[PDB]
Design a protein around this ligand. Structure first.
Ligand code: DO3
Ligand code: DO3
Ligand code: CL
Ligand code: CL
Ligand code: CL
Ligand code: CL
Ligand code: GD
Length: 129
Protein backbone atom coordinates (compact mmCIF):
# COMPACT_ATOMS: atom_id res chain seq x y z
CA UNK A 1 0.00 0.00 0.00
CA UNK A 2 1.28 3.45 -0.96
CA UNK A 3 -0.11 5.92 1.57
CA UNK A 4 -0.99 9.50 0.85
CA UNK A 5 0.91 11.99 3.03
CA UNK A 6 -2.01 13.02 5.27
CA UNK A 7 -3.42 9.50 5.24
CA UNK A 8 -0.17 8.19 6.73
CA UNK A 9 0.02 11.06 9.22
CA UNK A 10 -3.46 10.21 10.44
CA UNK A 11 -2.62 6.51 10.74
CA UNK A 12 0.59 7.20 12.67
CA UNK A 13 -1.20 9.62 14.98
CA UNK A 14 -3.94 7.09 15.65
CA UNK A 15 -1.31 4.49 16.57
CA UNK A 16 0.30 6.87 19.04
CA UNK A 17 3.49 7.78 17.12
CA UNK A 18 2.95 11.53 17.26
CA UNK A 19 5.27 12.94 19.95
CA UNK A 20 6.44 9.42 20.80
CA UNK A 21 9.82 9.72 22.59
CA UNK A 22 9.50 13.45 21.93
CA UNK A 23 9.39 13.21 18.14
CA UNK A 24 6.57 15.22 16.59
CA UNK A 25 4.40 13.68 13.87
CA UNK A 26 6.20 15.51 11.05
CA UNK A 27 9.44 13.77 11.99
CA UNK A 28 7.83 10.37 11.40
CA UNK A 29 6.16 11.36 8.15
CA UNK A 30 9.42 12.84 6.85
CA UNK A 31 11.32 9.68 7.83
CA UNK A 32 8.70 7.51 6.11
CA UNK A 33 8.87 9.62 2.96
CA UNK A 34 12.61 9.17 2.51
CA UNK A 35 12.84 5.62 3.81
CA UNK A 36 10.00 4.14 1.72
CA UNK A 37 8.26 6.94 -0.22
CA UNK A 38 5.18 5.93 1.83
CA UNK A 39 5.19 2.40 0.35
CA UNK A 40 4.51 -0.37 2.89
CA UNK A 41 5.98 -2.96 0.50
CA UNK A 42 9.42 -1.35 0.21
CA UNK A 43 12.39 -3.67 0.84
CA UNK A 44 16.10 -2.97 0.48
CA UNK A 45 19.11 -5.23 0.96
CA UNK A 46 21.95 -3.96 3.13
CA UNK A 47 25.62 -4.68 2.39
CA UNK A 48 25.89 -7.01 5.40
CA UNK A 49 23.14 -9.32 4.19
CA UNK A 50 20.31 -7.95 6.29
CA UNK A 51 17.23 -6.34 4.72
CA UNK A 52 15.14 -3.27 5.60
CA UNK A 53 11.34 -3.63 5.48
CA UNK A 54 8.27 -1.44 5.24
CA UNK A 55 7.37 2.23 5.55
CA UNK A 56 10.14 2.82 8.07
CA UNK A 57 12.64 0.31 6.65
CA UNK A 58 13.11 -1.74 9.80
CA UNK A 59 16.25 -3.91 9.74
CA UNK A 60 16.25 -7.72 9.98
CA UNK A 61 19.67 -7.57 11.72
CA UNK A 62 17.99 -6.77 15.05
CA UNK A 63 14.24 -6.26 14.76
CA UNK A 64 12.39 -8.88 12.73
CA UNK A 65 12.92 -12.36 11.39
CA UNK A 66 13.27 -12.95 7.65
CA UNK A 67 15.03 -16.31 7.84
CA UNK A 68 18.01 -15.11 5.83
CA UNK A 69 20.09 -12.87 8.09
CA UNK A 70 22.08 -15.57 9.91
CA UNK A 71 23.14 -14.57 13.41
CA UNK A 72 20.54 -11.79 13.68
CA UNK A 73 17.99 -10.95 16.35
CA UNK A 74 14.20 -10.54 16.23
CA UNK A 75 13.58 -8.03 19.01
CA UNK A 76 10.14 -7.03 17.74
CA UNK A 77 9.19 -10.72 17.71
CA UNK A 78 7.61 -10.58 14.24
CA UNK A 79 8.26 -11.94 10.76
CA UNK A 80 9.67 -9.12 8.62
CA UNK A 81 6.82 -9.70 6.16
CA UNK A 82 4.43 -8.34 8.83
CA UNK A 83 6.21 -5.01 8.28
CA UNK A 84 5.06 -4.96 4.65
CA UNK A 85 1.31 -5.13 5.39
CA UNK A 86 -1.22 -2.49 4.37
CA UNK A 87 -1.96 -2.19 8.11
CA UNK A 88 0.95 -0.29 9.72
CA UNK A 89 0.31 -1.45 13.30
CA UNK A 90 3.32 -3.81 13.30
CA UNK A 91 5.67 -1.24 11.79
CA UNK A 92 4.56 1.37 14.33
CA UNK A 93 4.89 -0.88 17.37
CA UNK A 94 8.33 -1.98 16.27
CA UNK A 95 9.42 1.58 15.46
CA UNK A 96 8.46 2.56 19.00
CA UNK A 97 10.92 -0.01 20.32
CA UNK A 98 13.71 1.15 18.01
CA UNK A 99 13.37 4.86 18.78
CA UNK A 100 13.46 3.93 22.49
CA UNK A 101 16.79 2.07 22.38
CA UNK A 102 19.00 5.06 23.16
CA UNK A 103 19.76 6.70 19.84
CA UNK A 104 16.31 8.09 19.11
CA UNK A 105 15.51 8.72 15.47
CA UNK A 106 19.19 8.67 14.46
CA UNK A 107 18.50 4.95 13.91
CA UNK A 108 16.99 6.04 10.59
CA UNK A 109 19.90 7.39 8.56
CA UNK A 110 17.55 9.09 6.08
CA UNK A 111 15.91 10.98 8.95
CA UNK A 112 19.27 12.23 10.25
CA UNK A 113 20.37 13.32 6.80
CA UNK A 114 17.15 14.69 5.35
CA UNK A 115 14.77 15.50 8.23
CA UNK A 116 16.81 16.39 11.30
CA UNK A 117 17.22 20.15 11.68
CA UNK A 118 14.53 21.07 9.18
CA UNK A 119 10.97 22.36 9.24
CA UNK A 120 9.35 18.96 9.78
CA UNK A 121 5.91 20.41 10.51
CA UNK A 122 5.73 21.07 6.80
CA UNK A 123 5.17 17.33 6.35
CA UNK A 124 1.79 17.44 8.09
CA UNK A 125 0.83 20.90 6.82
CA UNK A 126 -2.66 21.05 5.37
CA UNK A 127 -3.79 17.78 6.94
CA UNK A 128 -6.95 17.51 9.07
CA UNK A 129 -5.40 15.74 12.04
C1 DO3 B 1 18.08 -2.21 22.63
C2 DO3 B 1 18.86 -2.11 21.45
O1 DO3 B 1 20.07 -1.60 21.74
C3 DO3 B 1 19.03 -3.39 20.83
N1 DO3 B 1 20.13 -3.51 19.81
C4 DO3 B 1 19.85 -2.72 18.58
C5 DO3 B 1 21.09 -2.13 17.88
N2 DO3 B 1 22.09 -1.58 18.76
C6 DO3 B 1 21.75 -0.20 19.10
C7 DO3 B 1 22.49 0.40 20.26
O2 DO3 B 1 22.71 -0.38 21.23
O3 DO3 B 1 22.85 1.55 20.20
C8 DO3 B 1 23.34 -1.58 17.98
C9 DO3 B 1 24.19 -2.78 18.27
N3 DO3 B 1 24.22 -3.18 19.75
C10 DO3 B 1 25.28 -2.38 20.44
C11 DO3 B 1 25.22 -2.46 21.91
O4 DO3 B 1 24.07 -2.71 22.45
O5 DO3 B 1 26.26 -2.27 22.56
C12 DO3 B 1 24.52 -4.61 19.81
C13 DO3 B 1 23.30 -5.53 19.79
N4 DO3 B 1 22.29 -5.20 20.70
C14 DO3 B 1 22.63 -5.78 22.02
C15 DO3 B 1 21.80 -5.33 23.20
O6 DO3 B 1 21.23 -4.21 23.08
O7 DO3 B 1 21.74 -6.05 24.17
C16 DO3 B 1 21.04 -5.75 20.20
C17 DO3 B 1 20.15 -4.89 19.39
C1 DO3 C 1 27.90 -4.21 25.34
C2 DO3 C 1 27.75 -2.78 25.55
O1 DO3 C 1 26.45 -2.35 25.17
C3 DO3 C 1 27.95 -2.47 26.96
N1 DO3 C 1 27.37 -1.19 27.46
C4 DO3 C 1 28.13 0.00 26.97
C5 DO3 C 1 27.28 1.25 26.73
N2 DO3 C 1 25.97 1.02 26.18
C6 DO3 C 1 26.07 0.91 24.70
C7 DO3 C 1 24.82 0.50 23.97
O2 DO3 C 1 24.05 -0.23 24.60
O3 DO3 C 1 24.64 0.88 22.82
C8 DO3 C 1 25.21 2.23 26.49
C9 DO3 C 1 24.28 2.08 27.63
N3 DO3 C 1 23.65 0.72 27.78
C10 DO3 C 1 22.32 0.71 27.09
C11 DO3 C 1 21.77 -0.65 26.95
O4 DO3 C 1 22.60 -1.56 26.79
O5 DO3 C 1 20.54 -0.83 27.02
C12 DO3 C 1 23.44 0.52 29.24
C13 DO3 C 1 24.50 -0.30 29.97
N4 DO3 C 1 25.00 -1.39 29.24
C14 DO3 C 1 24.13 -2.59 29.49
C15 DO3 C 1 24.27 -3.77 28.53
O6 DO3 C 1 24.96 -3.59 27.51
O7 DO3 C 1 23.73 -4.83 28.82
C16 DO3 C 1 26.35 -1.66 29.70
C17 DO3 C 1 27.55 -1.18 28.92
CL1 CL D 1 17.55 -15.20 10.18
CL1 CL E 1 -3.11 1.40 9.28
CL1 CL F 1 15.97 11.30 21.57
CL1 CL G 1 5.54 18.23 13.28
GD1 GD H 1 22.03 -2.48 21.38
Amino acid sequence: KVFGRCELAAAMKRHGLDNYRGYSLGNWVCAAKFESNFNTQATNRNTDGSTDYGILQINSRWWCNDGRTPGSRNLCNIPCSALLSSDITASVNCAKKIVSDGNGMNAWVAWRNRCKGTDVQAWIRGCRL
